[PDB]
Amino acid sequence: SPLAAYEVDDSTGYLTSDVGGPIQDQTSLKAGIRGPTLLEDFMFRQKIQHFDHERVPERAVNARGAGAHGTFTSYADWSNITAASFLNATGKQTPVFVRFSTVAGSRGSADTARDVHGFATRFYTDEGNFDIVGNNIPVFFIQDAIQFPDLIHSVKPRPDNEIPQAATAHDSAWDFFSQQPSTMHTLFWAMSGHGIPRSYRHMDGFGVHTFRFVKDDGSSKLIKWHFKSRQGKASLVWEEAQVLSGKNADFHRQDLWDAIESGNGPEWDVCVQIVDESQAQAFGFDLLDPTKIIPEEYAPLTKLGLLKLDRNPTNYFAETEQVMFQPGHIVRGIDFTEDPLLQGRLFSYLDTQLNRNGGPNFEQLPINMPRVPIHNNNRDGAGQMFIHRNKYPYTPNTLNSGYPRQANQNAGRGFFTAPGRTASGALVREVSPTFNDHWSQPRLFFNSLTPVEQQFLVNAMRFEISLVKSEEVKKNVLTQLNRVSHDVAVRVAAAIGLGAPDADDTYYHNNKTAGVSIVGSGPLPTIKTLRVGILATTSESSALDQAAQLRTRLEKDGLVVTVVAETLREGVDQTYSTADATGFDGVVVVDGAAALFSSPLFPTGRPLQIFVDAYRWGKPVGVCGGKSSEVLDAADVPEDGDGVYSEESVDMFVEEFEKGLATFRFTDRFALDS
Amino acid sequence: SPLAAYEVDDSTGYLTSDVGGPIQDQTSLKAGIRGPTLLEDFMFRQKIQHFDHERVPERAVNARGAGAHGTFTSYADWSNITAASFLNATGKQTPVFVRFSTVAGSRGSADTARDVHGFATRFYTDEGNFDIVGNNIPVFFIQDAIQFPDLIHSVKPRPDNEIPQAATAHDSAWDFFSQQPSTMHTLFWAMSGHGIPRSYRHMDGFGVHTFRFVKDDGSSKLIKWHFKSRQGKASLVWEEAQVLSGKNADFHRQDLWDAIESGNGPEWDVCVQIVDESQAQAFGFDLLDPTKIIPEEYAPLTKLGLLKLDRNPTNYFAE
Amino acid sequence: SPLAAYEVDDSTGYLTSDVGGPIQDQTSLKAGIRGPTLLEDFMFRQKIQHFDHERVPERAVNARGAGAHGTFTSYADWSNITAASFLNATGKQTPVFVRFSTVAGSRGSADTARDVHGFATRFYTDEGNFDIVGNNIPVFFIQDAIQFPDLIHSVKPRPDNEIPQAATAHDSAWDFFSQQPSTMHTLFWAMSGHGIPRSYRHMDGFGVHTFRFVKDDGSSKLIKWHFKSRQGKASLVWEEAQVLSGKNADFHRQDLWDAIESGNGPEWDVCVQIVDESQAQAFGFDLLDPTKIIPEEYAPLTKLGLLKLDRNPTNYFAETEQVMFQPGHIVRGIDFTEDPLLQGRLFSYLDTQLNRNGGPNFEQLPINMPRVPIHNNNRDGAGQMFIHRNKYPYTPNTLNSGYPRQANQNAGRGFFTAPGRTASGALVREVSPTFNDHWSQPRLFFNSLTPVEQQFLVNAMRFEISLVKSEEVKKNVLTQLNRVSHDVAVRVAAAIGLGAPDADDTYYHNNKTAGVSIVGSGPLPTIKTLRVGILATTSESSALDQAAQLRTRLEKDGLVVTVVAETLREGVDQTYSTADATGFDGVVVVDGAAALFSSPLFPTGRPLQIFVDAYRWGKPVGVCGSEVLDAADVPEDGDGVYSEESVDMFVEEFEKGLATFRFTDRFALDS
Ligand code: HEM
Ligand code: HEM
Ligand code: HEM
Ligand SMILES: [Ca+2]
Ligand SMILES: [Ca+2]
Ligand SMILES: [Ca+2]
Ligand SMILES: [Ca+2]
Ligand SMILES: [Ca+2]
Ligand SMILES: [Ca+2]
Ligand SMILES: [Ca+2]
Ligand SMILES: [Ca+2]
Secondary structure, three states: OOOHHHEEOOOOOEOEOOOOOEOOOOOOOEOOOOOOEOOOOHHHHHHHHHHHOOOOOOOOOOOOEEEEEEEEEEOOEOOOOOOOHHHEOOOOEEEEEEEEEOOOOOOOOOOOOOOOOEEEEEEEEOOEEEEEEEEOOOOOOOOOHHHHHHHHHHHOOEOOOOEOOOOOOOHHHHHHHHHOHHHHHHHHHHHOHHHOEOOHHHOOEEOOOOEEEEOOOOOEEEEEEEEEEOOOOOEOOHHHHHHHHHHOOOHHHHHHHHHHHOOOOOEEEEEEEEEOHHHOOOOOOOOOOOOOOOOOOOOOEEEEEEEEEEEOOOOHHHHHHOOOOOOOOOOOOEEOOOOHHHHHHHHHHHHHHHHHHOOOOHHHOHHHOOOOOOOOOOOOOOOOOOEEOOOOOOOOOOOOOOOOEOOEOOEOOOOOOOOOOOOOOOEEOOOOHHHOOOOHHHHHHHHOOOHHHHHHHHHHHHHHHOOOOOHHHHHHHHHHHHHHOHHHHHHHHHHHOOOOOOOOHHHOOOOOOOOOOOHHHOOOOOOOOOEEEEEOOOOOHHHHHHHHHHHHHHHOOOOEEEEEEOOOEOOEOEEOOOOOHHHOOEEEEEHHHHHHOOEOOEOOOHHHHHHHHHHHOOOOEEEEOOOOHHHHHHOOOOOOOOOEEEEOOHHHHHHHHHHHHHHOOOHHHOOOOO | OHHHHOOOOOOOOOOEOOOOOEOOOOOOOEEOOOOOEEOOOHHHHHHHHHHHOOOOOOOOOOOOEEEEEEEEEEOOEOOOOOOOHHHEOOOOEEEEEEEEEOOOOOOOOOOOOOOOOEEEEEEEEOOEEEEEEEEOOOOOOOOOHHHHHHHHHHHOOEOOOOEOOOOOOOHHHHHHHHHOHHHHHHHHHHHOHHHOEOOHHHOOEEOOOOEEEEOOOOOEEEEEEEEEEOOOOOEOOHHHHHHHHHHOOOHHHHHHHHHHHOOOOOEEEEEEEEEEHHHOOOOOOOOOOOOOOOOOOOOOEEEEEEEEEEEOOOOOOOO | OHHHHOEEOOOOOEOEOOOOOEOOOOOOOEOOOOOOEEOOOHHHHHHHHHHHOOOOOOOOOOOOEEEEEEEEEEOOEOOOOOOOHHHEOOOOEEEEEEEEEOOOOOOOOOOOOOOOOEEEEEEEEOOEEEEEEEEOOOOOOOOOHHHHHHHHHHHOOEOOOOEOOOOOOOHHHHHHHHHOHHHHHHHHHHHOHHHOEOOHHHOOEEOOOOEEEEOOOOOEEEEEEEEEEOOOOOEOOHHHHHHHHHHOOOHHHHHHHHHHHOOOOOEEEEEEEEEEHHHOOOOOOOOOOOOOOOOOOOOOOEEEEEEEEEEOOOOHHHHHHOOOOOOOOOOOOEEOOOOHHHHHHHHHHHHHHHHHHOOOOHHHOHHHOOOOOOOOOOOOOOOOOOEEOOOOOOOOOOOOOOOOEOOEOOEOOOOOOOOOOOOOOOOOOOOOHHHOOOOHHHHHHHHOOOHHHHHHHHHHHHHHHHOOOOHHHHHHHHHHHHHHOHHHHHHHHHHHOOOOOOOOHHHOOOOOOOOOOOHHHOOOOOOOOOEEEEEOOOOOHHHHHHHHHHHHHHHHOOOEEEEEEOOOEOOEOEEOOOOOHHHOOEEEEEHHHHHHOOEOOEOOOHHHHHHHHHHHOOOOEEEEOOHHHHHOOOOOOOOOEEEEOOHHHHHHHHHHHHHHOOOHHHOOOOO
């Protein structure tokens, strides 16, 4: 364990105060047995003081999230492109901590809200902590950091009543998107399956901004970070995400925790697109613009190394709640660009940590400490944990022999700003006209989705915009959507009873780009960790025998099996009362249980509804045992449908079923606009 | 009202800093049109500093809740039982503010979690602010305040993974309940429909503790506070409440906001049960024990006044 | 020790950020060589952010202070009187940290203010940290903790202009004293030399309150803590203290630091008076009353152990500024009493540390950590430095097997309230009538001082009360003083041109008590560390020779010698320009320097003024090798005036003078 030095064991021993005096903490000290509590009860006050002070402010954004420890391993010595030490040798390993999150919701909001997601990675390198504070979507809503509070105020709950929680489905958000057209690209992403990923493990990570890789000789290249999931791309469907948000608000954090505990820690290839400084404006947009992607057709990915998360935190508050990332945590070999969104972020993280931590020594929390020595003249501050020996903490000095020494390009492996960087011109609060095309790339993204996928995106927009009360805002939203796609505007307008404006073809085109579609990304590369719900009954010993056999066959392949029946007993994990289709990636009914398809033990129709929901939401579903018509007919599920299975043979059933799990979603169950 | 004086109107005008200097806030100041951002950009830093510091710690318990302004009106001059000035004359009106809440969930969790609920009432009286910080259930889980962090750690999410949110449905909570039998009464209440009320307006409020009414002559009587809902008693069913948690996490706060905006502000009769000091142990239990109710058969309610909530906040955070 | 693990070495290495990235910190990153500074300069912002956030609130009181580390050693197994683990074996050693302080001044105010002084001692015991948060005066101004903000607002600067700093010499303070008669006892102590101690090492430590010693059998006795200085008792005189406040604001903290660095770390016998519970009102006053001492005639001292301070801090901010004492840091074998001053203190220290630290994990700071394992269910909070493995931090639990287990009188060496303690009666906001005598003990104290000592205390009151603008307050002050002593009232009234009220003999008496007088406590038991200024000249090679001969002798006897001359050179420590009589405990002029008694190198008459100030302030003074003594109007026959050609002889006599320390016959007395 990377933080073992800081762990406190309470598996033995007597209760003590924080200063080691043995005490009790179960009854207050009173003046008589039915008397008033005494002020001199220090046991009471120290315990309740601590409780009263347990909370710290949630993150201003990305308040809802979860983290894990792991390791990064480099695939090569990358000297040829960067001086970065963590990348300087094949097989070199660096500990990491990653936190994943939504953006809008507070603490305690649902994991399966539709939102942008954070993906923040710390590399505890041998030349300092390096943080990549990224998202699951490669482009951001706005083109200047100064706009962030406008965006976030608009998305977060209306400030008179604090409604609605963790949702863009309200007037203010769509007022802002329609007034600030830069938002279109990220908006289209958020309205796709990327807004409701199946898990943190099934999403990619992006730095969003263009950064620089800087060699020890001072030359630089432009880069984009892209962490490519080894688990596949996968989304929920919206109706499923809504039910999930109520049945399991902790869905993503539980999925990550469980995958790690089972030895299925998630992996990504840490990649970059690498281009020349001369290509800043060569691709038909400006690399300083965080609303644009570099299509892969123009710049392929270079795999730098492997990221694997394989260790859960010991204490969530101390590790996951207190981790404080900064894009300012940069190392020699990396530099910034003049992306005005990035530029302003550099200020915000350092300042906001004062808010959360309540004082300036937040880098001393165990989770934030580096894994190398610290030499500097930073002193004092509330919560100062060091005892500095150097009594002359100023530069230049002779009384400490000139130490610490200055580090720079030529000495001490100092960070240095890419020396080819320049600035010219007027000091201006002006937007570059190179940033002005807000619509072509949203259209590129949309064009690249499959037909059903395009339908899901249209449907997400229909859902949210139909909840906007202002007819003017709705009109304004159609005006912007229509600049990306007339057809999107027409289909969305249909649901809200307004007319779409006439086509405006300025930014329309037919181009597509690879690697942005979820539905088109093919079957999952692994089905380990995927969840199978076996619906059985205690009414028939035969049904539980079937479920035990099925369990064995499925578990051999690393699937997580839940057997559901009316009541618990050995071999049954979950009652119908607590079971839901959102708990599973595939659902199997054992034919011994066909009769179930009213009781005081579960809501009326529960067993059938689990099956029907799983089918409606695109999941593989099946009946095992040979007798299937009763169940399939009660569920209105066609026996010969794609992703519908019926076999007597457990082996055969499982072989076919596992293909369905990799396919993951049977999209021919969803209606399309004609 | 201290609040009228602090309302700020932004329906007109040019944007200013917090020190009244007119500014813009849409583009950062840069060294050239494609250049880096300048440290001298005070418009940027004041805006972003404020954003960076918007959040404050959520309440240690009852983090999820919603409030409204209203009035309390006394039905009589209650001098006969209490010196309390807000209760000293028929018709006397006192401004109030009430916040309703769940207990275990963080500030973004669902209103329809199964839980105890807070019902905290401030009376801004002519002799000082008086708060009755109560619940929708008349009895509490534990018999000594020193146990609170035990109960709350047990019911809040397990501290290695912070799972599960806003729920007693996990080992630690049931470990605590089964090890601490005082928990049984409140547990039974939370597992009834009182754990999943239909709205804040359809639940009652209780002080829980025995308090004292004290006359100007120094004499005292023992009292229980019970705010009786004029809307009636109603619950959700469990499956319904689970679905609502997903489809509308804001369900209770929206319900209250809407009732107020429509001129249907909710009402309670503020009542007490009143017994003599000599009855502290007369009913087969100790009135100092917050796990016990006084059955109405042993002590009827006296209606003191009318509490009505009829005005929503202007800014949720500030109020 | 928690502290060794947290020491950080910067004697080698390249500069890094706080996250270990090598950086520079001397030039801002700019858009061009004459260009504006960039927001992306993280090197600048992390450095400036830290600087901008260096300061923390000063202590609400006792903000000006200094600390050191040391050791406590028990003289015996004290089982027979207390269960306290640190007292349970002969020779048992416990690390300590002590901070000494004034009370009213802010953190940059002078050490030599006239004030009560704090003497706060932490014992890092093998059963928890135990703090005795005491003062250099055994009694306090007020009888109920709830009055503390009244006392402290009255003594601290007037709140419109924040004038005057670190002084009771203003109207509000004397308005409070004269309206709240409980203040008289501490006031008399503050107005004596106890208000201006010569150093932290020359003052005693007192717990003030009655506490309990509790045995493992549950029995208790009542105790007073008294730390008896092994360096002796000594004071400044007031004029010397005033000059010192300007010439060396750091005088006491420097004195302590130097004593430690020189292997002369200060010692105290840690003592108690011990009496039975039945004696709580047996001595003519109530032992719950913090305005009363137990005269030693009624209860002698038991020496429990030795306190020695012998190591300075490494980082003042991290150790001295951040140490957070609490009377709530109590251990098994000690209990509280129902002293209403002590009772409220218990709440204050815990709460105020939230203010200073800015979050609840202040016991995690290295200086506040214990030296034993911590097992509890305290969690989270800002600045949480632990990673707790127990994921069931509630009691009762089965999922962590019942741990941590409850500790109490019969398990786990738990703290327990003394079991014989009871309470009975109405719940009242009433002062016990047993607290009502505010004047007899102030009179006892005053009676116990030597005539010159009584003069000094009278002169302190004359000085301060003459600065009170309000005629009404001055009159009220005389009313109260007169209840203690009519003579004090008369003598103080004479300075302010008011008439004293007629004698009111209700509380007058002629009783005296041992151990409260400084002047009467005899010569100092050691003169090591005391300071000798040798006034010399570069004019005469012979002056320098004389000085160096004196130096050899005096340094072997543990004295700190400063040779002063017009300019620095080999063997000269200080210039006349920077020298002052307040820098010295004794002054010697070498024969060769007689000429100096105008130059661009020091102010006119500086050499003579040092000798004259030292004589006026009562110090041993001499000439080694007539004219100098004539120039200074100093009588050759005077007590503590030395005039010898023999160096050996001079040294022997002068060193007796240093032990006597002050020659009080140089001070005029009222007649
Ligand atoms: C490219 C666009 C951006 C991305 C990908 C991004 C990513 C993130 C992520 C992942 C987190 C959560 C880190 C964690 O898990 O603890 C975060 C937090 C935060 N972000 Fe950014 N963000 C971006 C833009 C901004 C901008 C423009 C600002 C302000 C000018 C900003 C201010 C914050 C603040 C104040 C926090 C809370 C940080 C803390 O308390 O530690 N974000 N952001
Ligand atoms: C009769 C049993 C109890 C009832 C009815 C009760 C009621 C409440 C209510 C209604 C709130 C929310 C007030 C608001 O809306 O802001 C609250 C908050 C709180 N409660 Fe209590 N509570 C009880 C027991 C306790 C105990 C025993 C403790 C501690 C020993 C305690 C500590 C707190 C704390 C620390 C908060 C947060 C207050 C704040 O941040 O303003 N509660 N409680
Ligand atoms: C017997 C009377 C008292 C004595 C001997 C005493 C002694 C002390 C000492 C020595 C300090 C400084 C500790 C240090 O060096 O850090 C101190 C600080 C303090 N005292 Fe007391 N005191 C007494 C009465 C009180 C009362 C009645 C209160 C309040 C009700 C009080 C509140 C404080 C506070 C708030 C501080 C600052 C503590 C900190 O910041 O850590 N004092 N006192
Ligand atoms: Ca809105
Ligand atoms: Ca540089
Ligand atoms: Ca649990
Ligand atoms: Ca019901
Ligand atoms: Ca009810
Ligand atoms: Ca004054
Ligand atoms: Ca004296
Ligand atoms: Ca024991």
